[PDB]
Amino acid sequence: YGPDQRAQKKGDIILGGLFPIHFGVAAKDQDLKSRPESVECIRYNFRGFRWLQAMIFAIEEINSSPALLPNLTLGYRIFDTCNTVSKALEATLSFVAQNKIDSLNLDCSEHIPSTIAVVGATGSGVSTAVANLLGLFYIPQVSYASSSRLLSNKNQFKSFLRTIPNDEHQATAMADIIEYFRWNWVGTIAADDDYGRPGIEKFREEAEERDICIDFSELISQYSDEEEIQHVVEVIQNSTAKVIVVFSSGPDLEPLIKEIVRRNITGKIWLASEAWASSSLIAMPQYFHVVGGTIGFALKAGQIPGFREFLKKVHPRKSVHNGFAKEFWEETFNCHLQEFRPLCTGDENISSVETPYIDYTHLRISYNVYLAVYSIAHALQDIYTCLPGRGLFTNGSCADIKKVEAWQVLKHLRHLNFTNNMGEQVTFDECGDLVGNYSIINWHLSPEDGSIVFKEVGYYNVYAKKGERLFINEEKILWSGFSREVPFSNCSRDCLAGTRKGIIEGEPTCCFECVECPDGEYSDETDASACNKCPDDFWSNENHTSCIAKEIEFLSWTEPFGIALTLFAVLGIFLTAFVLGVFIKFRNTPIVKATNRELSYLLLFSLLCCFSSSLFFIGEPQDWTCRLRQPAFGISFVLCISCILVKTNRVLLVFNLQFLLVFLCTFMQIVICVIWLYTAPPSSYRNQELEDEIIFITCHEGSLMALGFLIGYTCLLAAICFFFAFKSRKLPENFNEAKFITFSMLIFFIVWISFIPAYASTYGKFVSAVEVIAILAASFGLLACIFFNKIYIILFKPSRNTIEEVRCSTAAHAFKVAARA
Amino acid sequence: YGPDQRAQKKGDIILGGLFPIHFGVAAKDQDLKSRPESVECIRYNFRGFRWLQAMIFAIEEINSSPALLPNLTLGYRIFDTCNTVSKALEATLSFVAQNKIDSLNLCSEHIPSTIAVVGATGSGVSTAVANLLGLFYIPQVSYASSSRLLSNKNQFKSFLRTIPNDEHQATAMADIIEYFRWNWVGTIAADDDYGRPGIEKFREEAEERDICIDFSELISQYSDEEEIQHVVEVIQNSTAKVIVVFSSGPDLEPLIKEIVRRNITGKIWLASEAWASSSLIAMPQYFHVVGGTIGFALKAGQIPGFREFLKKVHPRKSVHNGFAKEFWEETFNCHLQEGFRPLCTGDENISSVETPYIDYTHLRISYNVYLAVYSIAHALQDIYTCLPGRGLFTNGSCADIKKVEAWQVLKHLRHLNFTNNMGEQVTFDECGDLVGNYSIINWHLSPEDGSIVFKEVGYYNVYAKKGERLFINEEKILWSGFSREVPFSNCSRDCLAGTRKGIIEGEPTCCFECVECPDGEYSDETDASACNKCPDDFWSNENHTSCIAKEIEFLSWTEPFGIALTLFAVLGIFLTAFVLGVFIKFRNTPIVKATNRELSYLLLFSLLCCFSSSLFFIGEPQDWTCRLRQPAFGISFVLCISCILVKTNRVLLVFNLQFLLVFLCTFMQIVICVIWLYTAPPSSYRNQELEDEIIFITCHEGSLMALGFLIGYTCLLAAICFFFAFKSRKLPENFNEAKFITFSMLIFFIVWISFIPAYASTYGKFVSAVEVIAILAASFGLLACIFFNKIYIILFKPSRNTIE
Numbered sequence A: 001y002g003p004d005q006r007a008q009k010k011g012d013i014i015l016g017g018l019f020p021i022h023f024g025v026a027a028k029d030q031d032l033k034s035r036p037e038s039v040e041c042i043r044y045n046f047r048g049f050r051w052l053q054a055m056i057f058a059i060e061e062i063n064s065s066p067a068l069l070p071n072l073t074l075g076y077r078i079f080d081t082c083n084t085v086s087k088a089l090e091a092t093l094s095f096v097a098q099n100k101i102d103s104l105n106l107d108c109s110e111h112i113p114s115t116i117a118v119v120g121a122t123g124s125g126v127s128t129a130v131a132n133l134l135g136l137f138y139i140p141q142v143s144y145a146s147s148s149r150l151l152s153n154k155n156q157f158k159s160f161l162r163t164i165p166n167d168e169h170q171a172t173a174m175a176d177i178i179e180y181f182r183w184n185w186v187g188t189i190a191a192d193d194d195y196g197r198p199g200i201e202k203f204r205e206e207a208e209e210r211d212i213c214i215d216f217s218e219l220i221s222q223y224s225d226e227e228e229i230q231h232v233v234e235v236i237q238n239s240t241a242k243v244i245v246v247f248s249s250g251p252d253l254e255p256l257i258k259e260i261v262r263r264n265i266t267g268k269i270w271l272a273s274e275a276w277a278s279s280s281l282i283a284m285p286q287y288f289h290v291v292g293g294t295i296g297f298a299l300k301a302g303q304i305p306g307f308r309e310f311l312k313k314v315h316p317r318k319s320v321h322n323g324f325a326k327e328f329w330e331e332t333f334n335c336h337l338q339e340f341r342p343l344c345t346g347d348e349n350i351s352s353v354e355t356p357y358i359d360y361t362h363l364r365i366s367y368n369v370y371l372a373v374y375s376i377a378h379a380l381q382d383i384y385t386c387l388p389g390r391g392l393f394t395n396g397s398c399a400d401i402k403k404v405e406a407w408q409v410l411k412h413l414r415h416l417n418f419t420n421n422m423g424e425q426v427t428f429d430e431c432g433d434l435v436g437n438y439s440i441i442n443w444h445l446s447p448e449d450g451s452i453v454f455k456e457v458g459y460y461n462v463y464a465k466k467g468e469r470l471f472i473n474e475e476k477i478l479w480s481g482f483s484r485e486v487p488f489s490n491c492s493r494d495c496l497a498g499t500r501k502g503i504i505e506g507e508p509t510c511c512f513e514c515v516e517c518p519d520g521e522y523s524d525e526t527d528a529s530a531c532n533k534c535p536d537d538f539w540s541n542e543n544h545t546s547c548i549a550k551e552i553e554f555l556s557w558t559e560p561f562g563i564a565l566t567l568f569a570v571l572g573i574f575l576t577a578f579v580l581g582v583f584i585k586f587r588n589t590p591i592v593k594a595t596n597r598e599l600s601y602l603l604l605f606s607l608l609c610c611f612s613s614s615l616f617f618i619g620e621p622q623d624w625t626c627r628l629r630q631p632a633f634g635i636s637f638v639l640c641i642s643c644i645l646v647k648t649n650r651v652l653l654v655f656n657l658q659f660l661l662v663f664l665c666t667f668m669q670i671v672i673c674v675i676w677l678y679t680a681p682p683s684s685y686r687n688q689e690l691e692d693e694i695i696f697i698t699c700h701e702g703s704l705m706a707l708g709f710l711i712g713y714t715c716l717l718a719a720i721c722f723f724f725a726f727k728s729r730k731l732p733e734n735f736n737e738a739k740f741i742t743f744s745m746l747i748f749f750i751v752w753i754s755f756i757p758a759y760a761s762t763y764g765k766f767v768s769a770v771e772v773i774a775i776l777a778a779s780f781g782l783l784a785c786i787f788f789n790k791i792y793i794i795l796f797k798p799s800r801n802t803i804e805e806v807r808c809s810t811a812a813h814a815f816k817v818a819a820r821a
Numbered sequence B: 001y002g003p004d005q006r007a008q009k010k011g012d013i014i015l016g017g018l019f020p021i022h023f024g025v026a027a028k029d030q031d032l033k034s035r036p037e038s039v040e041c042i043r044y045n046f047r048g049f050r051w052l053q054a055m056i057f058a059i060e061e062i063n064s065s066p067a068l069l070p071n072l073t074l075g076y077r078i079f080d081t082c083n084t085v086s087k088a089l090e091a092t093l094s095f096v097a098q099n100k101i102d103s104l105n106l107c108s109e110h111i112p113s114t115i116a117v118v119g120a121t122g123s124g125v126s127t128a129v130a131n132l133l134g135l136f137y138i139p140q141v142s143y144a145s146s147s148r149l150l151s152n153k154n155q156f157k158s159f160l161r162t163i164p165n166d167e168h169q170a171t172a173m174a175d176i177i178e179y180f181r182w183n184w185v186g187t188i189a190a191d192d193d194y195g196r197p198g199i200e201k202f203r204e205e206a207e208e209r210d211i212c213i214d215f216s217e218l219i220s221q222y223s224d225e226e227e228i229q230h231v232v233e234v235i236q237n238s239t240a241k242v243i244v245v246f247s248s249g250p251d252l253e254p255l256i257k258e259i260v261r262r263n264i265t266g267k268i269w270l271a272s273e274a275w276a277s278s279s280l281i282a283m284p285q286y287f288h289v290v291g292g293t294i295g296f297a298l299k300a301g302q303i304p305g306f307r308e309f310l311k312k313v314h315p316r317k318s319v320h321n322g323f324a325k326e327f328w329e330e331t332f333n334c335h336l337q338e339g340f341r342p343l344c345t346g347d348e349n350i351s352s353v354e355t356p357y358i359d360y361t362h363l364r365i366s367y368n369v370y371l372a373v374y375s376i377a378h379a380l381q382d383i384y385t386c387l388p389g390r391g392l393f394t395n396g397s398c399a400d401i402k403k404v405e406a407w408q409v410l411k412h413l414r415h416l417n418f419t420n421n422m423g424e425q426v427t428f429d430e431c432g433d434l435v436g437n438y439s440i441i442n443w444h445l446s447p448e449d450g451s452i453v454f455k456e457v458g459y460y461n462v463y464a465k466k467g468e469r470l471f472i473n474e475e476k477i478l479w480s481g482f483s484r485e486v487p488f489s490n491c492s493r494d495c496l497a498g499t500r501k502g503i504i505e506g507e508p509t510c511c512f513e514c515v516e517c518p519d520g521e522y523s524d525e526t527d528a529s530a531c532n533k534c535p536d537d538f539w540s541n542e543n544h545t546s547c548i549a550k551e552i553e554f555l556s557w558t559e560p561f562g563i564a565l566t567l568f569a570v571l572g573i574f575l576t577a578f579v580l581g582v583f584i585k586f587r588n589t590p591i592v593k594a595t596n597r598e599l600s601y602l603l604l605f606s607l608l609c610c611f612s613s614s615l616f617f618i619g620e621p622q623d624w625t626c627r628l629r630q631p632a633f634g635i636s637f638v639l640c641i642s643c644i645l646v647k648t649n650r651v652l653l654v655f656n657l658q659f660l661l662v663f664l665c666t667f668m669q670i671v672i673c674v675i676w677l678y679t680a681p682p683s684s685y686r687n688q689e690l691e692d693e694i695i696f697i698t699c700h701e702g703s704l705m706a707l708g709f710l711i712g713y714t715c716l717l718a719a720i721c722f723f724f725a726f727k728s729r730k731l732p733e734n735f736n737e738a739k740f741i742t743f744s745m746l747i748f749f750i751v752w753i754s755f756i757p758a759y760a761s762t763y764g765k766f767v768s769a770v771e772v773i774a775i776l777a778a779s780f781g782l783l784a785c786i787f788f789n790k791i792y793i794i795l796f797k798p799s800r801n802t803i804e
């Protein structure tokens, strides 16, 4: 009773089966103008038939063993679901036919069989729908393929168990693979069912913690219409993201792949979930230029030893218990069995045709089917061997094996721990789950046959700690089926050393602009968020990748200018010392004795101090040299001017008594200098505001009226000396001294007046060189005006140094005779 | 047959119904050490019993009316689901017991046949019931299930609903958040088929409008202590104040109880429709946490005899309602004697106890139940009045009302269009849905008894054009129950003008810092992502809000410096004209023909030209003053130098010829200036790179070689005349003028060497000043020591003293 096409065999204990022998149903959703009929399954699935044969082979192998359930046989009733909720519910209503009559008091045939457990429901929505109806009657349901996390809820799904791991490790592993290859710009596609939606939600939650930006997220279906598919295609080809993560199955993904292949969209990196990473619907050679280089997940393979020889024994006339063998024979050989295609014989050979039935290389879901059947058999064997007094039920009492009920088998399945043929331990946890490792594979092209080869490139170990679970061998991956270069999948290129990041408005964090830093700031590492302002006495490059030290500007002792000015100063000091020496040697003579013999000594000492006071303007301006820069020249030159002015002419008649005048004339300068240095002294000053890349060192004078008073006092005494010596230029005594005094005063005023435009233009820039040159020029002019004339008669023409020449000049000059050479 | 507690009446045509009379089932763990019993239902639900009474009132009203299905009765079988999939699945297997026997080909043979089911409340229960009812094409009309996943007609073939689905609601929450200008919110969903698509649609709509979501959590009714503690810790670690909740009342009650136990105040709760009017959550003792909630409600309908029917209920007079006895026990808190808690009597008054049964303002879900029943009956009436030859079936054939089948009822339900008691039109679309408006409520506190009052503060109009659907009256909102101020729920504070948003690493784009703008760039808006560049002739102000105009710089008139230079030039022109006038006055005295008096006229005219040539430097250069700046002074000063050098000693004997030897040395310079002006003319220039804040206006010379030749010829002529006047400085003829020529050339060379460091140092306004001052000083010195001694001799010294 129930569906017609089935696999059935009698026994003492009956198991139920649910497998997708067809991929789907015929699209015939029309109005109800006639009474509705049964739908028609459309596309044959050879892999599902192999799964059904795995369950049949496991049952036969259990029934031949004397060590597992002796003297009682197992039977089966297996139906087709066609990947559809409605066919599975039609089969499940016949699974619970005995139990439902008792609950509804409906009463009658009294010869209907009871199933104790159900193996089946590949797809997760089909699994949830079957689990809802089976959990009413506490019938256990072991699934070989459904991996949704929503079926781990034991409040709603009381009797559901799995031989496959659930999909949360897979989503975490997908995030880990994206993190390993250093991408941050991806798109996601999931199937709109109970399988794709929670997996892609877990992947989104994991990708948010690892700073991965997701651009698009779309949903697809097997029964999607055309305009939805073109909306998804325009969403895909409007993005610059290359990596697409797909959580779907084969028949749910086929129309989108067909539309993408038709439009020739190339260069995408597909990350596949386990449900389509080995599908024969997607892995076609004609699709390769779109789907080459896919990276995907696989489960761990197992060995069922005599299974291939069992698969090679199928026949339509010999399989009396398998009602699916006839259509399998017709779809393999494209023929028709009697009772337009030609008539089948039974002589045809399975090895001649290439379908996924016997052309596989690893058993993964088939091993899960085998493990499910053996789990149920080991729970039954635990029932059979249990000793009175040590059971799992009330008082420690044992179930009866000849009247066994389904809830007792479910209770024994919750406490199961057995060893399989691989020598590993199979137990289920509190949520009914079962952990396992993952293999990581990559799609290649076969050079010989042209088909698609699945190459193992890594693994995911679930028993390691978080962060150390992934292994990938990068050298074995071909990236679009041909290339050895890891692709670029970021939103924007990396900012370089001279730049920083900038926000683009309305766009996520992974997309940024690269902005040049300003003239004062730098950056050194790659993806900077801000330019660091490096501290004082530093400035950036022209390229802003670092910053370098500023340049300190001042006049030092090692410049050529400094050596030249030092040589001129030392030569002046040597010449003045030479003149003092010849005055000391050739004394007691009328030329020296006529020049008062004591004012000349102090005049030469003043000239020595005025020459040596120009050395404070060269070097680094410190706090104390800036205090003695200006007063040193200010007192030395006024001492020299007073020594010149005291000796000239009848001004001494206006009132030794000569020295007191010099004493007052330099003591006034001494007191104004000491009150200036005690009220507000000058000090050094590091100027950075004039030019950006150069620190000047200059001197701030403090007060300004004190400096004006100093220069005014010196110019006042110079003008008084010039005026009083300007009257007396016609007296031809002492070798015409007053003419040279007026010449020296004129030289002083001309130099310090003509140096005015040089002083105001380059103010703040090395003006101390100008201040050295003016001092040296004035000192040289005064010394050469006063002493060299008398030196020429004293040294090179003696016996003219006589009293008769001082009182009456004999008209012979030094400079004309020296210029005559 | 089936479940024991039921409501049941007989009839010709039988409808089915599913309502939650209890809030859930007893939380017990099955160790499976004995055979499992049936689970027990707990926490009576008075609103659900009112919902069940709506269906019976509708069916009795239809049965008493002669204008709708005459001579034909309706019956019912109604069961309790307890918000659970398994109880509803037992009830649904009781519904389909006739149809399933024929499909399996599998005793009583008098089994009644259900032709339609009034649906469930929650979407998981509706999906599980619809999966089984679609196998037999039995129509199912739900009054409350609003999930989008039930709009898929490939999976759910026979499902209809009188409630709008949740996509408009999830768009409306994002519209509310956009209206109050928030960008930093959190979400909480219930882990079922109701909360997950609602929060997914909200997340997509909020990412469309630049709203950043901080956290996202799932809750349930059966969450334990550690999950609730984790969710409360996730809430308490976040600065987001606005929280959007998509859940029902039973699924949200444990989280709310734990938040109340910790006194977490200050959050802004945004309520979906399932818990926005829930008595489990809207309690006075929770008002310090969930006060001021803004939520959604459906539109209210009117059923004009329904309250009287609700008050006619009785445990011993309702013989078709099995749910009345437990209602009566739970209302009056007693025990009913069958056929401490006191013994109930039959004489109690329903108005004495405040339960949600007759304590309501508006009928919203009850009106949906009423519409579901009337939709089914109007489909049956459309069957009953079909005319032969115009049916909906094959060849235009009509179904038979005495032998009706459920697929024909579903076919007529897909083509239904009728008018209701409120005067609106009821049709279902191709996905089986029905749109409707929303009302927006705010949770206040009553000053009378302390209960929670729902106040209407706006609407959402789904018939309007997108972007114009929301209306909010803000003056009626009390935030947190007491405050009249809109709260702040942004991640970061705003950056003002003169600042730029800077990135914080590892954080979303709604969180940023503020960095000041650079010197040459400006930003006037707030929350500016970058500084904008000022234009070419503009610079930014002191806080970089707007560009101000760049200052221009040149030596100008009405400046004090330019006025002083102009007064000195006018004074020089005046005294040179005085000297010329005195010389033309005494043109017939011996001391004037002592020199060549025709040459001194040319010398004084060239001195006038040399004074007048200095006025071209002052003012703004206008691209023709730059052409006449340098050649005018060049030719005037070489005319002065040649006029001096002709009259010196022993050059005129070398060679009337004086004017020719003037003409050659001025014609050479005229040739140089005219070649320079014809080949590469000077041009004006606006210099901007010297200061980057001021624009200097200068003259680009155009050629340096020609300017070098122009200077060098003048220097050469000055050197030759200096040498030829230096050889004969001791001669006393012409009042010792050779030493004065020597002094004039010495002054010229001293000034033009003294002003050379002022050309390599300063660059702006102050260079034209020194070009005026050097010209003035050189020409003043030349004129002074050439024509002052003779002027003293003629004028101030007596003319009787040595004029012969």
Ligand SMILES: *[C@@H]1O[C@H](CO)[C@@H](O[C@@H]2O[C@H](CO)[C@@H](O)[C@H](O)[C@H]2NC(C)=O)[C@H](O)[C@H]1NC(C)=O
Pocket: A231, A234, A235, A238
């Ligand atoms: C993909 O991008 C294209 C290119 O911009 C979009 O096409 C344009 O869309 C705008 C928006 O209304 C229209 O004004 C233009 O007329 C469209 N141009 C063309 C050539 O169609 C397109 O809408 C985008 N699609 C998706 C799904 O985002």
Ligand SMILES: *[C@@H]1O[C@H](CO)[C@@H](O[C@@H]2O[C@H](CO)[C@@H](O)[C@H](O)[C@H]2NC(C)=O)[C@H](O)[C@H]1NC(C)=O
Pocket: A182, A183, A184, A210, A211, A488, A490, A493, A494
């Ligand atoms: C693409 O973007 C990622 C994410 O920012 C970059 O990965 C960073 O690379 C730098 C340099 O190697 C590391 O210091 C960071 O730790 C990486 N971040 C993360 C989260 O792993 C990646 O370098 C970018 N790729 C390209 C080609 O620009």
Ligand SMILES: *[C@@H]1O[C@H](CO)[C@@H](O[C@@H]2O[C@H](CO)[C@@H](O)[C@H](O)[C@H]2NC(C)=O)[C@H](O)[C@H]1NC(C)=O
Pocket: B181, B182, B183, B210, B488, B490, B493, B494
């Ligand atoms: C919180 O952030 C939002 C941005 O998401 C701000 O809204 C902007 O406000 C400015 C000025 O008030 C408007 O010019 C923009 O058009 C608004 N943008 C949007 C998208 O609405 C909001 O002002 C911020 N709130 C506070 C208190 O700073």
Ligand SMILES: *[C@@H]1O[C@H](CO)[C@@H](O[C@@H]2O[C@H](CO)[C@@H](O)[C@H](O)[C@H]2NC(C)=O)[C@H](O)[C@H]1NC(C)=O
Pocket: B230, B233, B234, B237
């Ligand atoms: C919420 O914030 C608290 C406060 O930091 C976190 O508690 C600390 O977590 C760190 C890291 O796990 C521990 O080292 C500390 O001992 C914790 N306690 C304290 C008092 O600092 C808590 O982990 C956060 N929770 C969530 C869900 O974010």
Ligand SMILES: *[C@@H]1O[C@H](CO)[C@@H](O[C@@H]2O[C@H](CO)[C@@H](O)[C@H](O)[C@H]2NC(C)=O)[C@H](O)[C@H]1NC(C)=O
Pocket: B424, B437, B459, B460, B461, B462, B463
């Ligand atoms: C949904 O709400 C809108 C606005 O609340 C209703 O439109 C109003 O209809 C009345 C009468 O038809 C008019 O007087 C108002 O001017 C309308 N307002 C606006 C803003 O258009 C609309 O009728 C409601 N729809 C339903 C089905 O009740």
Ligand SMILES: C[C@@H](N[C@H]1CCN(c2ccc(CC(=O)O)cc2)C1)c1cccc2ccccc12
Pocket: A630, A631, A633, A634, A707, A710, A711, A714, A715, A749, A752, A753, A755, A756, A759, A771, A775
């Ligand atoms: C070395 C100099 N110091 C600096 C300070 C400003 N400066 C300066 C330059 C030119 C003039 C025009 C003028 O009056 O001829 C006036 C001043 C030069 C100095 C120090 C002390 C006394 C001085 C006495 C007389 C001249 C120089 C003096």
Ligand SMILES: C[C@@H](N[C@H]1CCN(c2ccc(CC(=O)O)cc2)C1)c1cccc2ccccc12
Pocket: B630, B631, B633, B634, B701, B710, B711, B714, B715, B752, B759, B771, B775
């Ligand atoms: C008034 C003077 N003007 C000349 C003097 C120096 N000057 C100048 C201008 C620009 C640069 C290059 C730069 O800075 O880009 C260099 C020099 C401009 C003048 C005019 C004509 C003949 C003269 C004969 C003798 C002395 C002066 C003469």
Ligand SMILES: N[C@@H](Cc1c[nH]c2ccccc12)C(=O)O
Pocket: A122, A123, A124, A125, A145, A146, A147, A148, A195, A249, A250, A274, A275, A276, A365
């Ligand atoms: N995990 C899938 C089922 C599945 C696993 N592997 C497969 C291979 C082929 C087809 C389906 C599958 C689901 O729950 O829906």
Ligand SMILES: N[C@@H](Cc1c[nH]c2ccccc12)C(=O)O
Pocket: B121, B122, B123, B144, B145, B146, B147, B194, B248, B249, B273, B274, B275, B365
């Ligand atoms: N829409 C809710 C059901 C619902 C609507 N309004 C309600 C009021 C109270 C309880 C439940 C509801 C769901 O699908 O789950």
Ligand SMILES: *[C@@H]1O[C@H](CO)[C@@H](O)[C@H](O)[C@H]1NC(C)=O
Pocket: A417, A418, A425, A427
């Ligand atoms: C299963 O059995 C093995 C040995 O019999 C034991 O080591 C292991 O812990 C058991 N597993 C569980 C989950 O009890």
Ligand SMILES: *[C@@H]1O[C@H](CO)[C@@H](O)[C@H](O)[C@H]1NC(C)=O
Pocket: A437, A459, A460, A461, A462, A463
């Ligand atoms: C999982 O993978 C790791 C690493 O390859 C391996 O050591 C471990 O044994 C595997 N686990 C199982 C159960 O096979």
Ligand SMILES: *[C@@H]1O[C@H](CO)[C@@H](O)[C@H](O)[C@H]1NC(C)=O
Pocket: A496, A497, A498, A542, A543, A545
């Ligand atoms: C900038 O220029 C310098 C030398 O000109 C060079 O060494 C440096 O690498 C450059 N920086 C960048 C980021 O190109």
Ligand SMILES: *[C@@H]1O[C@H](CO)[C@@H](O)[C@H](O)[C@H]1NC(C)=O
Pocket: B417, B418, B425, B427
């Ligand atoms: C329903 O009937 C009314 C009355 O004629 C009509 O205006 C309206 O368009 C109809 N609606 C549909 C969906 O046919």
Ligand SMILES: *[C@@H]1O[C@H](CO)[C@@H](O)[C@H](O)[C@H]1NC(C)=O
Pocket: B542, B543, B545
């Ligand atoms: C700029 O800032 C100053 C003080 O910091 C203030 O006086 C002035 O008004 C500001 N200008 C603008 C345009 O805000």
Ligand SMILES: [Ca+2]
Pocket: A062, A063, A064, A065, A066, A067, A068, A069, A070, A071, A072
């Ligand atoms: Ca056996």
Ligand SMILES: [Ca+2]
Pocket: A506, A507, B207, B208, B210
């Ligand atoms: Ca955006």
